Amino acid sequence: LAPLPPHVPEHLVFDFDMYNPSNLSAGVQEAWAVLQESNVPDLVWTRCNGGHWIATRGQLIREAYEDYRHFSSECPFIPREAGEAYDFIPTSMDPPEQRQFRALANQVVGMPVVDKLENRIQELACSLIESLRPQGQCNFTEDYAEPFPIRIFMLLAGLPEEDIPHLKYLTDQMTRPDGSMTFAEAKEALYDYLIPIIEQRRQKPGTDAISIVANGQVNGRPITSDEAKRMCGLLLVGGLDTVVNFLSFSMEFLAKSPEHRQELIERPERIPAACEELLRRFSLVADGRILTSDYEFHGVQLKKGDQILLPQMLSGLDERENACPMHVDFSRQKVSHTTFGHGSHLCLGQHLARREIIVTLKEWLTRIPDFSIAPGAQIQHKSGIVSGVQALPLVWDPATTKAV
Numbered sequence: 001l002a003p004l005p006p007h008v009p010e011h012l013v014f015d016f017d018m019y020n021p022s023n024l025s026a027g028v029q030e031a032w033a034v035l036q037e038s039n040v041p042d043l044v045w046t047r048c049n050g051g052h053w054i055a056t057r058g059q060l061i062r063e064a065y066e067d068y069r070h071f072s073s074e075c076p077f078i079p080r081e082a083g084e085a086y087d088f089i090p091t092s093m094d095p096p097e098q099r100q101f102r103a104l105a106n107q108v109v110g111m112p113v114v115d116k117l118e119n120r121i122q123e124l125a126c127s128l129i130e131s132l133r134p135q136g137q138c139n140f141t142e143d144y145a146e147p148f149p150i151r152i153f154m155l156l157a158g159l160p161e162e163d164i165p166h167l168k169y170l171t172d173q174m175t176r177p178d179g180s181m182t183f184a185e186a187k188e189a190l191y192d193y194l195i196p197i198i199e200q201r202r203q204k205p206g207t208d209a210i211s212i213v214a215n216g217q218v219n220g221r222p223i224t225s226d227e228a229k230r231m232c233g234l235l236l237v238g239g240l241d242t243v244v245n246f247l248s249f250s251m252e253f254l255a256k257s258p259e260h261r262q263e264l265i266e267r268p269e270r271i272p273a274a275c276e277e278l279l280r281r282f283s284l285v286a287d288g289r290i291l292t293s294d295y296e297f298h299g300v301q302l303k304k305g306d307q308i309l310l311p312q313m314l315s316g317l318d319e320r321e322n323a324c325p326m327h328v329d330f331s332r333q334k335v336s337h338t339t340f341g342h343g344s345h346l347c348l349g350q351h352l353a354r355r356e357i358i359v360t361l362k363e364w365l366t367r368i369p370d371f372s373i374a375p376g377a378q379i380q381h382k383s384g385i386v387s388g389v390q391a392l393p394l395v396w397d398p399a400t401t402k403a404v
């Protein structure tokens with residue numbers, strides 16, 4: 001517990017630990033939802049993780065994401081040292097400089113790219129699932145959720161399949177840390193992999209994402225090598241743990257809810273809506289911002305340099321915006337969430353991510369309509385900037401399945 005700053009009133013202190021919240025055993029969204037109990041104010045200060053604010057309600061979360069002038073992305077992670085070291089593009093930039101970098105990134109992971117990749121996304125899902133189907137078991141996180149998005153990235157980035165276990169090694173070191181290296185070191189090791197590739201594709205561009213970013217123009221001039229690297233690191237990591245962990249949450253839920261599986265089998269037209277309602281219920285990101293100036297917000301004095309956690313996760317779980325928020329209803333009306341963020345940094349990958357989710361749901365239930373959690377296994381969640389599932393052992397009777 002860091003010393004409480006004298007500008008912070010004691011009545012706003014609530015020592016939530018985003019990397020190890022109490023009651024994690026109840027589920028990680030449930031653990032974060034403690035922040036929305038009736039005796040917790042809308043904006044609190046936690047002394048954990050160096051000390052920082054947390055906005056606990058959708059209205060404040062969206063407001064702060066809109067107000068980039070006060071709430072800057074230059075240090076967007078807790079703890080401060082990680083946020084300081086972090087320099088990916090565009091996530092560590094504010095508008096207006098951010099806008100042209102975001103437009104360049106949009107050309108390589110935005111919507112039209114989706115239609116070009118869609119046949120490979122479909123084929124990859126089907127091939128992975130058929131490999132598992134006859135076995136009657138898998139560790140879903142390891143056997144489907146991890147290989148699916150990284151294979152898609154390698155295709156969009158024009159990288160060879162054999163590079164996958166090394167890239168995985170490198171991203172795990174960053175995003176699945178064990179305290180052996182600092183964020184800065186893991187980040188540099190990732191940059192070491194990308195720097196030669198960007199050099200190569202600046203001399204000899206192709207039509208892959210790295211070539212397009214590395215040869216782009218921004219605010220009137222060519223992008224530098226360093227800018228390209230910082231963009232490519234985000235394009236790699238952006239759709240990896242988010243998708244891995246979101247799919248895992250979704251499949252845990254479906255494994256525990258035969259009635260919702262049957263619903264999507266009998267009414268496949270509801271799968272897009274189901275995707276949105278799972279994105280709401282199993283929202284999983286929590287990053288934040290740094291104050292650019294002293295600012296009073298919702299009656300609370302914020303100080304220049306204070307960090308504020310703005311959990312994307314919480315908006316859709318807020319009872320003030322969605323009734324019975326922990327309940328999953330594929331027929332829910334007025335589904336609201338900020339799962340993909342809000343404001344100037346609203347996820348560029350969201351159309352790709354929804355395609356990945358919808359293809360998985362449809363192709364999984366087509367071949368393996370009936371499955372359960374392995375008997376006896378205790379599913380464990382993890383919490384942090386991207387919350388997730390540690391492992392997801394599933395079982396089924398292969399006689400209930402079909403090759404398609």
Ligand code: HEM
Pocket residue numbers: 073076089090091092102105109234235236238239240242243246284285287288312339340341342344345346347348349350352353
């Ligand atoms: C379920 C999956 C995903 C979730 C929940 C998710 C969530 C988010 C969130 C919350 C942000 C905003 C962060 C900020 O405001 O600080 C964001 C930004 C972004 N994400 Fe996604 N993401 C997902 C998938 C992907 C995928 C598949 C990619 C593809 C490479 C991707 C690319 C990006 C990029 C480039 C940005 C930065 C946009 C900018 O800063 O203007 N995302 N994502």
Ligand SMILES: CN(C)c1cccc2c(S(=O)(=O)NCCCCCCCCNC(=O)[C@]34C[C@H]5C[C@H](C[C@H](C5)C3)C4)cccc12
Pocket residue numbers: 019077078079082088091174175177178179180181182183234237238239242285287385386
């Ligand atoms: C107990 N031990 C094990 C530990 C516990 C806790 C911290 C530890 C750290 S730490 O404190 O240095 N690491 C905590 C922050 C790690 C940042 C990961 C995000 C980077 C990639 N993602 C994004 O860019 C994005 C950017 C954006 C938001 C979000 C989703 C998408 C889009 C991708 C993230 C170091 C070592 C050990 C630690």
Ligand SMILES: [K+]
Pocket residue numbers: 074075076083084085086087092
């Ligand atoms: K920084």
